[PDB]
Amino acid sequence: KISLDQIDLLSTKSFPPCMRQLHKALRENHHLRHGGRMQYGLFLKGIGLTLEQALQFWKQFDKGYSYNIRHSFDYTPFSCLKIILSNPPSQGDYHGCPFRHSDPELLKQKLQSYKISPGGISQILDLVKGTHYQVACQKYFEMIHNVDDCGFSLNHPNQFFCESQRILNG
Amino acid sequence: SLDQIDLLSTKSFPPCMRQLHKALRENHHLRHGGRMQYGLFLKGIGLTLEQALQFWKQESYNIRHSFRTDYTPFSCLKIILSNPPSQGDYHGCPFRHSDPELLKQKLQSYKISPGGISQILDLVKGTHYQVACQKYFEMIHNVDDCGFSLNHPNQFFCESQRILNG
Numbered sequence: 652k653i654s655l656d657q658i659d660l661l662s663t664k665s666f667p668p669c670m671r672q673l674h675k676a677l678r679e680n681h682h683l684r685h686g687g688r689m690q691y692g693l694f695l696k697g698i699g700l701t702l703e704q705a706l707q708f709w710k711q712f713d714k715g716y717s718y719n720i721r722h723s724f725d726y727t728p729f730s731c732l733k734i735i736l737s738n739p740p741s742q743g744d745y746h747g748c749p750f751r752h753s754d755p756e757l758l759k760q761k762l763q764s765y766k767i768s769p770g771g772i773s774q775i776l777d778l779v780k781g782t783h784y785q786v787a788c789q790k791y792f793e794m795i796h797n798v799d800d801c802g803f804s805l806n807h808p809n810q811f812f813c814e815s816q817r818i819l820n821g
Numbered sequence: 822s823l824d825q826i827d828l829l830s831t832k833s834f835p836p837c838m839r840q841l842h843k844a845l846r847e848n849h850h851l852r853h854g855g856r857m858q859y860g861l862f863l864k865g866i867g868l869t870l871e872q873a874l875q876f877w878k879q880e881s882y883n884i885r886h887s888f889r890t891d892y893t894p895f896s897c898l899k900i901i902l903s904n905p906p907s908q909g910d911y912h913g914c915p916f917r918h919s920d921p922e923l924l925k926q927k928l929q930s931y932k933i934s935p936g937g938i939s940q941i942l943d944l945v946k947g948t949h950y951q952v953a954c955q956k957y958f959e960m961i962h963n964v965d966d967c968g969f970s971l972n973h974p975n976q977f978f979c980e981s982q983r984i985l986n987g
């Protein structure tokens with residue numbers, strides 16, 4: 652067992668926006684609805700981690716849940732197209748793809764909170780207007796890693812993670 | 822404690838780290854080059870290799886979840902191009918540093934098919950060490966194309982974990 656706050660830095664450095672938002676929502680709300688638990692949990696599964704949900708003894712608003720991580724040593728982790736094209740999030744949901752599912756003004760605010768430069772935000776929003784969600788995410792990747800070219804064709808959040816970790820490990 | 826990742830090593834470690842895990846299990850020790858290569862690889866997956874000491878004794882390897890020094894894991898080119906292993910050293914890259922006959926025997930013990938071993942040895946003879954390792958990856962995971970360009974052992978591990986948990 653491992654605390655869920657241990658991967659805060661990893662989430663900011665290597666998670667794609669779809670999983671970064673879900674980690675943040677889990678940390679702040681102490682719970683995710685089923686759509687988020689599936690998207691984020693299966694993403695963690697693809698890295699070799701087991702998300703675990705627990706109910707606290709004092710639960711008879713705070714729903715009384717506690718989430719943690721455990722290192723793993725038959726649900727398939729979601730691809731980009733599955734996240735973008737299926738299961739659009741309702742108002743209680745934090746899952747989905749921010750480039751496809753966030754209102755553009757809210758998306759701009761979100762990218763600003765991520766410290767993306769104004770030019771990068773402009774390029775990303777341009778790509779979003781063309782419905783090129785994964786290309787916009789490749790742009791996000793390039794901005795957050797300070798590289799000119801991501802060097803791969805993005806089609807999976809876990810692929811995003813592996814390529815980010817490759818860059819970070821030299 | 823280290824025996825827990827034997828299976829993990831057979832399924833997800835690249836040959837360079839699989840050989841170091843085997844050597845640690847069998848010799849109960851690694852020299853500094855091997856400890857660095859393997860330990861930094863393990864740190865990158867979230868594990869801390871350490872030796873146990875009794876605190877009450879006045880002046881055995883295990884692993885623990887990681888939870889002061891540069892922990893950056895070695896890349897393929899750093900392993901391949903520097904620190905060639907001496908006898909007694911188990912570090913390095915098997916595609917670059919193992920005699921081809923020993924590499925073929927090792928791949929046989931890894932249950933690679935004869936045709937796959939032939940492909941790998943052809944690539945090694947051309948000095949395409951990372952491409953040979955990509956081919957190894959494709960064989961042990963039964964996939965047509967690995968779908969990535971390999972230049973880091975921890976990247977090998979990450980893509981393997983994607984497939985095994987896919």
Ligand code: SF4
Nearest residue numbers: 667669731748788808
């Ligand atoms: S493009 Fe793919 S990886 Fe990027 S945020 Fe959208 S679903 Fe996630």
Ligand code: SF4
Nearest residue numbers: 835837897914954974
């Ligand atoms: S090519 Fe890289 S990952 Fe593969 S065995 Fe050699 S050093 Fe390890």
